[PDB]
Protein backbone atom coordinates (compact mmCIF):
# COMPACT_ATOMS: atom_id res chain seq x y z
CA UNK A 1 0.00 0.00 0.00
CA UNK A 2 2.62 2.15 0.20
CA UNK A 3 4.54 1.67 -2.97
CA UNK A 4 6.19 4.97 -4.60
CA UNK A 5 7.81 4.46 -8.20
CA UNK A 6 6.46 3.89 -11.25
CA UNK A 7 4.93 1.20 -13.03
CA UNK A 8 5.41 0.88 -17.02
CA UNK A 9 2.82 -0.98 -19.12
CA UNK A 10 2.42 -1.78 -22.91
CA UNK A 11 0.87 -3.80 -25.48
CA UNK A 12 3.33 -6.50 -26.25
CA UNK A 13 1.38 -8.92 -28.50
CA UNK A 14 3.25 -8.38 -31.48
CA UNK A 15 6.27 -9.95 -29.10
CA UNK A 16 5.12 -12.38 -27.00
CA UNK A 17 2.14 -13.88 -28.74
CA UNK A 18 2.49 -16.71 -31.73
CA UNK A 19 -0.51 -18.21 -33.90
CA UNK A 20 0.83 -21.72 -32.30
CA UNK A 21 0.63 -20.19 -28.40
CA UNK A 22 2.93 -18.54 -26.49
CA UNK A 23 3.01 -21.62 -23.73
CA UNK A 24 6.31 -20.07 -22.08
CA UNK A 25 4.45 -18.11 -19.80
CA UNK A 26 2.52 -19.30 -16.43
CA UNK A 27 1.01 -18.05 -13.66
CA UNK A 28 0.09 -18.87 -10.04
CA UNK A 29 -3.83 -19.96 -9.78
CA UNK A 30 -4.03 -22.05 -6.49
CA UNK A 31 -2.64 -21.37 -3.75
CA UNK A 32 -2.74 -21.99 -0.24
CA UNK A 33 -2.46 -18.41 1.10
CA UNK A 34 -1.91 -14.69 -0.16
CA UNK A 35 1.18 -13.25 -1.52
CA UNK A 36 3.49 -10.83 0.67
CA UNK A 37 4.11 -7.50 -1.02
CA UNK A 38 7.16 -8.41 -3.11
CA UNK A 39 7.20 -11.72 -2.22
CA UNK A 40 7.76 -14.57 -5.34
CA UNK A 41 6.58 -18.21 -4.73
CA UNK A 42 8.35 -20.51 -7.85
CA UNK A 43 6.97 -23.67 -5.83
CA UNK A 44 5.33 -26.03 -8.36
CA UNK A 45 4.15 -28.74 -6.15
CA UNK A 46 0.30 -29.56 -6.53
CA UNK A 47 -2.07 -27.44 -4.44
CA UNK A 48 -4.47 -29.81 -2.81
CA UNK A 49 -8.04 -28.42 -3.58
CA UNK B 1 35.60 -10.79 26.61
CA UNK B 2 33.65 -9.53 23.04
CA UNK B 3 29.94 -9.51 23.09
CA UNK B 4 28.24 -9.73 19.24
CA UNK B 5 24.59 -8.59 18.41
CA UNK B 6 22.62 -9.14 15.53
CA UNK B 7 19.48 -8.49 14.23
CA UNK B 8 17.62 -10.22 11.06
CA UNK B 9 14.66 -8.42 9.78
CA UNK B 10 12.33 -9.18 6.51
CA UNK B 11 9.64 -7.32 5.72
CA UNK B 12 7.72 -6.57 2.32
CA UNK B 13 10.56 -8.73 0.90
CA UNK B 14 13.50 -6.99 2.03
CA UNK B 15 15.96 -8.41 4.47
CA UNK B 16 17.50 -6.35 6.88
CA UNK B 17 20.80 -6.83 8.90
CA UNK B 18 22.06 -4.79 11.91
CA UNK B 19 25.01 -5.68 13.77
CA UNK B 20 26.99 -3.90 16.94
CA UNK B 21 29.87 -5.08 18.74
CA UNK B 22 30.14 -4.07 22.67
CA UNK B 23 33.05 -5.17 24.59
CA UNK B 24 31.96 -6.24 28.04
CA UNK B 25 33.33 -7.44 31.34
CA UNK B 26 33.56 -11.07 32.32
CA UNK B 27 31.48 -10.83 35.31
CA UNK B 28 27.37 -11.95 33.27
CA UNK B 29 26.88 -11.75 30.00
CA UNK B 30 24.02 -9.49 28.29
CA UNK B 31 24.70 -6.84 30.95
CA UNK B 32 22.42 -3.70 31.30
CA UNK B 33 22.72 -0.71 29.13
CA UNK B 34 21.76 0.29 25.48
CA UNK B 35 23.80 -0.26 22.38
CA UNK B 36 22.20 1.34 20.11
CA UNK B 37 22.92 -1.30 16.28
CA UNK B 38 23.92 0.09 13.16
CA UNK B 39 22.59 -0.99 9.66
CA UNK B 40 24.92 -3.12 7.44
CA UNK B 41 23.45 -5.12 5.06
CA UNK B 42 20.18 -4.26 3.01
CA UNK B 43 18.76 -6.72 0.41
CA UNK B 44 16.04 -8.15 -1.38
CA UNK B 45 15.02 -11.34 -1.73
CA UNK B 46 11.04 -11.65 -1.88
CA UNK B 47 10.92 -15.36 -0.35
CA UNK B 48 8.78 -16.93 2.79
CA UNK C 1 15.01 -12.92 15.34
CA UNK C 2 17.37 -11.02 17.47
CA UNK C 3 20.87 -12.81 17.70
CA UNK C 4 23.77 -12.58 19.95
CA UNK C 5 26.63 -14.33 21.09
CA UNK C 6 30.09 -14.02 23.07
CA UNK C 7 31.97 -17.11 22.12
CA UNK C 8 35.50 -16.54 21.57
CA UNK C 9 37.35 -16.62 18.27
CA UNK C 10 34.10 -16.10 16.23
CA UNK C 11 33.31 -19.73 16.06
CA UNK C 12 30.05 -19.34 14.57
CA UNK C 13 30.20 -18.34 11.23
CA UNK C 14 26.68 -17.55 9.68
CA UNK C 15 23.14 -18.30 9.71
CA UNK C 16 20.65 -20.00 7.48
CA UNK C 17 16.89 -19.06 6.45
CA UNK C 18 13.87 -20.37 4.67
CA UNK C 19 10.45 -21.69 5.37
CA UNK C 20 10.81 -25.58 4.46
CA UNK C 21 14.87 -25.75 4.49
CA UNK C 22 14.63 -28.95 1.43
CA UNK C 23 15.04 -27.63 -1.44
CA UNK C 24 11.61 -27.37 -2.45
CA UNK C 25 11.71 -23.30 -1.83
CA UNK C 26 13.89 -20.71 -2.13
CA UNK C 27 16.09 -19.93 1.13
CA UNK C 28 18.32 -17.48 2.60
CA UNK C 29 22.40 -18.84 3.40
CA UNK C 30 24.72 -16.54 4.95
CA UNK C 31 28.24 -17.95 5.38
CA UNK C 32 31.56 -16.02 7.21
CA UNK C 33 34.91 -16.54 7.44
CA UNK C 34 38.61 -14.69 7.76
CA UNK C 35 38.48 -13.23 4.00
CA UNK C 36 35.12 -12.74 2.22
CA UNK C 37 31.56 -13.50 3.24
CA UNK C 38 28.81 -15.09 0.69
CA UNK C 39 25.37 -13.95 0.88
CA UNK C 40 22.86 -16.56 -1.92
CA UNK C 41 19.56 -17.40 -1.35
CA UNK C 42 18.75 -20.36 -3.34
CA UNK C 43 16.90 -23.95 -2.67
CA UNK C 44 19.23 -25.47 -0.39
CA UNK C 45 18.60 -29.20 0.55
CA UNK C 46 19.97 -28.03 4.32
CA UNK C 47 21.55 -31.19 6.33
CA UNK C 48 20.58 -32.19 9.25
CA UNK D 1 3.49 -25.81 -47.11
CA UNK D 2 4.69 -22.94 -46.52
CA UNK D 3 7.32 -21.11 -48.73
CA UNK D 4 9.77 -18.84 -49.05
CA UNK D 5 11.41 -17.30 -51.63
CA UNK D 6 13.40 -14.08 -53.06
CA UNK D 7 14.06 -12.51 -56.00
CA UNK D 8 16.25 -13.38 -58.52
CA UNK D 9 19.99 -12.41 -58.84
CA UNK D 10 20.80 -8.67 -60.00
CA UNK D 11 23.80 -7.18 -60.64
CA UNK D 12 23.68 -3.66 -61.07
CA UNK D 13 26.50 -0.62 -61.11
CA UNK D 14 26.94 1.88 -57.81
CA UNK D 15 23.95 4.19 -57.35
CA UNK D 16 21.94 2.42 -58.92
CA UNK D 17 19.61 2.04 -55.58
CA UNK D 18 18.23 -1.76 -56.75
CA UNK D 19 15.38 -3.37 -55.04
CA UNK D 20 15.12 -7.46 -53.90
CA UNK D 21 11.41 -8.80 -53.67
CA UNK D 22 10.73 -11.53 -51.00
CA UNK D 23 7.14 -13.90 -51.60
CA UNK D 24 6.08 -16.05 -49.00
CA UNK D 25 3.04 -18.12 -48.69
CA UNK D 26 1.36 -20.52 -46.68
CA UNK D 27 0.94 -19.02 -43.36
CA UNK D 28 -0.30 -15.54 -41.84
CA UNK D 29 1.90 -13.13 -43.29
CA UNK D 30 0.52 -10.71 -40.37
CA UNK D 31 2.00 -12.22 -37.26
CA UNK D 32 5.41 -13.41 -38.05
CA UNK D 33 8.29 -11.21 -37.94
CA UNK D 34 10.04 -11.10 -41.37
CA UNK D 35 13.71 -9.94 -41.92
CA UNK D 36 16.89 -10.51 -44.39
CA UNK D 37 20.27 -11.21 -43.34
CA UNK D 38 23.79 -10.06 -45.13
CA UNK D 39 26.56 -12.60 -46.01
CA UNK D 40 29.61 -10.94 -47.75
CA UNK D 41 31.52 -13.51 -49.59
CA UNK D 42 34.00 -14.71 -47.26
CA UNK D 43 32.52 -13.80 -44.33
CA UNK D 44 29.68 -14.33 -42.20
CA UNK D 45 26.55 -13.86 -41.40
CA UNK D 46 25.45 -9.95 -40.90
CA UNK D 47 22.22 -9.04 -39.59
CA UNK D 48 20.14 -6.29 -40.77
CA UNK D 49 16.95 -5.95 -39.71
CA UNK D 50 13.55 -7.50 -39.45
CA UNK D 51 9.67 -5.84 -40.25
CA UNK D 52 6.39 -7.12 -38.48
CA UNK D 53 4.01 -7.26 -41.21
CA UNK D 54 0.93 -6.58 -39.19
CA UNK D 55 1.96 -3.04 -39.01
CA UNK D 56 4.51 -0.07 -39.47
CA UNK D 57 7.11 -1.34 -36.49
CA UNK D 58 10.48 -1.80 -37.69
CA UNK D 59 13.76 -2.87 -36.25
CA UNK D 60 17.01 -2.39 -37.60
CA UNK D 61 20.74 -3.42 -36.59
CA UNK D 62 22.83 -0.09 -35.22
CA UNK D 63 25.44 -1.15 -37.89
CA UNK D 64 22.61 -0.98 -40.64
CA UNK D 65 19.97 2.15 -39.41
CA UNK D 66 20.52 4.06 -42.57
CA UNK D 67 22.24 2.02 -44.72
CA UNK D 68 19.54 0.03 -46.01
CA UNK D 69 16.08 -0.16 -45.22
CA UNK D 70 13.18 -2.74 -44.79
CA UNK D 71 9.55 -2.60 -45.77
CA UNK D 72 6.73 -5.05 -46.77
CA UNK D 73 3.18 -5.72 -47.80
CA UNK D 74 0.84 -7.21 -45.88
CA UNK D 75 -2.12 -7.07 -48.80
CA UNK D 76 0.31 -9.22 -50.64
CA UNK D 77 2.58 -10.85 -48.13
CA UNK D 78 5.42 -9.58 -50.66
CA UNK D 79 8.57 -8.16 -48.38
CA UNK D 80 10.71 -5.60 -50.07
CA UNK D 81 14.74 -4.40 -49.79
CA UNK D 82 15.85 -0.75 -51.22
CA UNK D 83 19.16 0.62 -51.18
CA UNK D 84 20.84 4.24 -51.97
CA UNK D 85 23.87 5.43 -52.67
CA UNK D 86 25.41 1.90 -53.34
CA UNK D 87 29.20 1.16 -52.79
CA UNK D 88 31.85 -1.14 -53.85
CA UNK D 89 31.23 -2.99 -50.89
CA UNK D 90 27.63 -3.39 -50.52
CA UNK D 91 28.31 -6.66 -52.56
CA UNK D 92 26.91 -9.86 -50.48
CA UNK D 93 24.37 -12.94 -50.54
CA UNK D 94 21.08 -11.79 -49.01
CA UNK D 95 19.08 -14.30 -47.07
CA UNK D 96 15.70 -13.47 -46.11
CA UNK D 97 13.95 -15.46 -42.55
CA UNK D 98 10.86 -15.22 -40.49
CA UNK D 99 10.03 -16.33 -37.23
CA UNK D 100 8.48 -19.58 -37.65
CA UNK D 101 6.76 -21.48 -34.53
CA UNK D 102 9.68 -22.93 -33.59
CA UNK D 103 11.05 -20.26 -30.60
CA UNK D 104 10.18 -16.82 -29.52
CA UNK D 105 9.97 -13.66 -32.01
CA UNK D 106 13.55 -13.07 -32.80
CA UNK D 107 14.57 -16.08 -33.46
CA UNK D 108 15.08 -17.06 -37.16
CA UNK D 109 13.13 -20.44 -37.58
CA UNK D 110 13.23 -20.35 -41.75
CA UNK D 111 15.03 -19.35 -44.13
CA UNK D 112 15.22 -18.51 -48.36
CA UNK D 113 16.54 -19.73 -51.22
CA UNK D 114 19.04 -16.56 -50.81
CA UNK D 115 19.71 -13.69 -53.90
CA UNK D 116 22.65 -12.86 -55.05
CA UNK D 117 23.79 -8.91 -55.45
CA UNK D 118 26.88 -7.98 -57.09
CA UNK D 119 27.81 -4.40 -57.42
CA UNK D 120 30.97 -3.43 -59.84
CA UNK D 121 31.57 -0.93 -62.37
CA UNK D 122 32.34 -3.31 -65.50
CA UNK D 123 29.06 -2.74 -66.56
CA UNK D 124 28.96 -6.69 -67.08
CA UNK D 125 30.99 -7.64 -69.60
CA UNK D 126 29.82 -10.41 -72.10
CA UNK D 127 31.08 -14.05 -72.23
CA UNK D 128 32.74 -15.94 -74.84
CA UNK D 129 32.37 -19.70 -75.64
CA UNK D 130 34.41 -21.79 -77.02
CA UNK D 131 34.55 -25.89 -77.21
CA UNK D 132 37.67 -28.37 -75.97
CA UNK D 133 43.10 -38.39 -76.82
CA UNK D 134 39.67 -38.49 -75.16
CA UNK D 135 39.52 -42.31 -76.36
CA UNK D 136 35.66 -40.71 -73.52
CA UNK D 137 34.61 -37.49 -72.65
CA UNK D 138 33.62 -34.05 -74.08
CA UNK D 139 33.35 -30.64 -72.65
CA UNK D 140 32.95 -26.48 -73.61
CA UNK D 141 35.38 -23.46 -72.48
CA UNK D 142 33.78 -20.65 -71.28
CA UNK D 143 36.18 -17.28 -70.74
CA UNK D 144 36.20 -13.28 -70.69
CA UNK D 145 33.24 -13.10 -68.53
CA UNK D 146 32.88 -10.79 -65.35
CA UNK D 147 29.80 -11.71 -63.62
CA UNK D 148 30.25 -14.78 -61.44
CA UNK D 149 26.62 -16.79 -61.56
CA UNK D 150 27.15 -17.83 -65.06
CA UNK D 151 25.33 -21.49 -65.48
CA UNK D 152 25.89 -24.00 -68.38
CA UNK D 153 23.79 -27.36 -69.06
CA UNK D 154 24.09 -29.50 -72.11
CA UNK D 155 21.39 -30.49 -74.86
CA UNK D 156 18.83 -27.98 -72.96
CA UNK D 157 19.13 -29.71 -69.56
CA UNK D 158 18.73 -33.34 -71.38
CA UNK D 159 22.14 -34.79 -70.43
CA UNK D 160 22.50 -34.94 -66.29
CA UNK D 161 23.82 -38.10 -65.62
CA UNK D 162 28.20 -37.86 -66.14
CA UNK D 163 27.65 -34.28 -66.41
CA UNK D 164 30.67 -32.53 -64.49
CA UNK D 165 31.30 -29.01 -64.01
CA UNK D 166 35.08 -27.80 -62.59
CA UNK D 167 35.33 -24.09 -60.85
CA UNK D 168 35.85 -21.33 -62.28
CA UNK D 169 39.70 -19.75 -63.09
CA UNK D 170 40.23 -15.96 -62.25
CA UNK D 171 42.36 -14.99 -65.09
CA UNK D 172 44.84 -12.47 -64.90
CA UNK D 173 43.39 -9.62 -66.83
CA UNK D 174 40.58 -9.80 -64.76
CA UNK D 175 38.07 -12.18 -65.87
CA UNK D 176 36.94 -15.60 -64.63
CA UNK D 177 36.88 -18.50 -66.76
CA UNK D 178 35.35 -22.40 -66.16
CA UNK D 179 34.60 -25.56 -68.02
CA UNK D 180 32.28 -28.43 -67.72
CA UNK D 181 32.51 -31.45 -68.79
CA UNK D 182 29.73 -34.72 -69.67
CA UNK D 183 30.57 -38.44 -69.83
CA UNK D 184 30.22 -39.95 -73.32
CA UNK D 185 26.03 -33.21 -77.57
CA UNK D 186 26.06 -29.00 -77.74
CA UNK D 187 26.70 -27.33 -74.87
CA UNK D 188 24.48 -24.18 -73.52
CA UNK D 189 25.82 -21.67 -71.64
CA UNK D 190 23.45 -19.03 -70.51
CA UNK D 191 24.62 -15.45 -69.36
CA UNK D 192 21.54 -14.73 -67.03
CA UNK D 193 22.90 -10.94 -66.03
CA UNK D 194 23.17 -10.58 -69.54
CA UNK D 195 20.46 -12.93 -70.98
CA UNK D 196 23.10 -13.59 -73.11
CA UNK D 197 22.28 -17.79 -74.25
CA UNK D 198 25.33 -19.03 -76.33
CA UNK D 199 24.70 -22.97 -77.93
CA UNK D 200 28.11 -24.70 -79.15
CA UNK D 201 28.84 -28.18 -80.28
CA UNK D 202 31.69 -30.32 -79.38
Known amino acids: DDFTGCVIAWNSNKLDSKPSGNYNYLYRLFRKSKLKPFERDISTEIYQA | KNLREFVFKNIDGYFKIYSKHTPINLERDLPQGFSALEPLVDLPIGIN | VYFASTEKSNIIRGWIFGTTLDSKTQSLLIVNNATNVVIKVCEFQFCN | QMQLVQSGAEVKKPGESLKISCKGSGYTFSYYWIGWVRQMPGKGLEWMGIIYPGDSDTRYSPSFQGQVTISADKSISTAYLHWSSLKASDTAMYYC??????????????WGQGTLVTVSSASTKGPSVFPLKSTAALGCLVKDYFPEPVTVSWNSGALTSGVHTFPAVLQSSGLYSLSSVVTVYICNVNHKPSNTKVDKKV
Open chain 4, 97 to 110: ARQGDLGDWILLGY
